[PDB]
Design an enzyme around this catalytic site. Structure first.
Site, PDB file in Angstrom:
ATOM      1  N   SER A 114     -60.144  -3.363  27.267  1.00 42.27           N
ATOM      2  CA  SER A 114     -59.634  -3.188  28.621  1.00 42.27           C
ATOM      3  C   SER A 114     -59.555  -4.557  29.361  1.00 42.27           C
ATOM      4  CB  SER A 114     -60.394  -2.085  29.303  1.00 42.27           C
ATOM      5  OG  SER A 114     -59.672  -1.607  30.441  1.00 42.27           O
ATOM      6  N   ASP A 165     -53.016   6.649  27.283  1.00 43.56           N
ATOM      7  CA  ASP A 165     -53.829   5.882  28.244  1.00 43.56           C
ATOM      8  C   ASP A 165     -53.209   5.862  29.606  1.00 43.56           C
ATOM      9  OD1 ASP A 165     -55.330   3.877  29.598  1.00 43.56           O
ATOM     10  OD2 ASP A 165     -55.588   2.708  27.734  1.00 43.56           O
ATOM     11  N   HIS A 197     -57.923   6.051  27.303  1.00 43.86           N
ATOM     12  CA  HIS A 197     -58.546   4.724  27.540  1.00 43.86           C
ATOM     13  C   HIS A 197     -59.899   4.669  26.861  1.00 43.86           C
ATOM     14  CE1 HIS A 197     -58.335   0.874  29.365  1.00 43.86           C
ATOM     15  NE2 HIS A 197     -59.481   1.035  30.008  1.00 43.86           N
TER      16      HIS A 197
END
Lengths: 215, 223
Positions: A114, A165, A197
């Site tokens: 991320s 996501d 995610h």
């Protein structure tokens, strides 16, 4: 400022390679060092280290942030600003690690999730000699227009992303692939169908396979 | 001391075993047009004093040299004409031969690409780059003395690994002019190689003392 966080020494007592794991917004190094625990059985000459990001996370005071974010917004501008503020801190951490281990960029794999994948690509591609590889889970390229100008080395890059996501949309990694290829990097993409995610099992397997190719 | 020795072409030439008795690394030395492995193994003798865990091998190229029947060629040249065409066809024909030699050597010694530096002079340098950059697993390094990139557009599409590369070239060279390595350097950087260039000022088509010292220091960095 000095970063620190959990580390796992090489199973064999003398590291020949290094994997630096970079957590996402609101997470911490303890979270990411579990990937290290998973892999260390397979890569016994590899040391794993998972620094905590330099600031307390604005949204989760129990975790950390590489840079701050504003909510209920498209976060494009927070990324732009923030990646350049975090960059010198991460760069200095990497120098400190190389000093402590006698290793260098060529022995090193930057792995991020991320926000941490965003940093892995931003800092990693600016290093003047190439890393062994970058593995970026569920990120993107912050300031792609600056990259042509500022890119300093071309390690191979594996981009891994969940197609469902809704936090960092998959087009992040899908647009990154041709951009890095256009720049001379040997980049590959793996899309985890049906996943959001997170690091899917299939994403993790893909990364393990890539590590086997280079370690 | 020692010596290995269309069809499966097996290359012969001198070998120096590791001074220490157990090789941890491997330097393959590739001679120029009209030379031979016996010539290039002398670089091996010089370097074995500094690198006691390195084995050195200098294969003879696979064909008798058309211009010097006492030496060898990786591929034929027509010396009276522009050499572009001869290099293009020639490197492509020689590539599989060199690739097979490397494979056979790795199987014979139990060392692999990551333990190996490919070193070439002139036509051997051209081959070191052409074959070295097409290997699917990277070498520890390539050292190209007085060479160039044969088929730079093909390399863009065919490059398979990205070892560090050191180019060394004399600026008075009228045989393979210095432009070869000067244009090579940015091409290799654009492809993502960690490439460097050292010009030996005042030297022609040879390895100058300063080129040799530059190479030795680079070997010390990576070995």
């Amino acid at each position: 400022v000095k970063l620190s966080g959990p580390m796992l020494p090489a199973v064999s007592g003398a590291a020949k390679s290094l994997v630096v794991l970079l957590h996402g917004y609101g997470s911490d190094g303890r979270d990411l060092i579990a990937l290290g625990q998973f892999w260390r059985d397979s890569f016994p000459d590899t040391m794993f280290v998972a620094p905590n990001a330099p600031h307390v996370c604005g949204g989760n005071p129990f975790g950390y942030e590489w840079f701050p974010l504003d909510l209920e917004r498209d976060r494009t501008l927070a990324r732009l600003a923030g990646a350049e503020t975090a960059h010198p801190v991460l760069d200095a951490f990497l120098a400190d690690l190389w000093a402590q281990t006698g290793l260098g960029p060529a022995d090193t794999i930057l792995v991020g999730f991320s926000q941490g994948a965003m940093m892995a690509l931003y800092t990693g591609l600016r290093l003047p000699e190439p890393l062994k590889a970058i593995i970026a889970f569920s990120g993107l390229i912050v300031a792609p227009e600056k990259l042509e100008a500022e890119i300093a080395s071309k390690p191979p890059v594996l981009l891994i992303h969940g197609d469902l996501d809704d936090v960092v949309p998959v087009i992040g990694s899908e647009t990154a692939l041709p951009k890095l290829i256009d720049l001379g990097i040997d980049a590959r993409l793996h899309i985890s169908q049906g996943s959001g995610h997170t690091i899917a099992q299939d994403g993790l397997d893909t990364a393990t396979a890539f590590l086997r190719e280079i370690l």
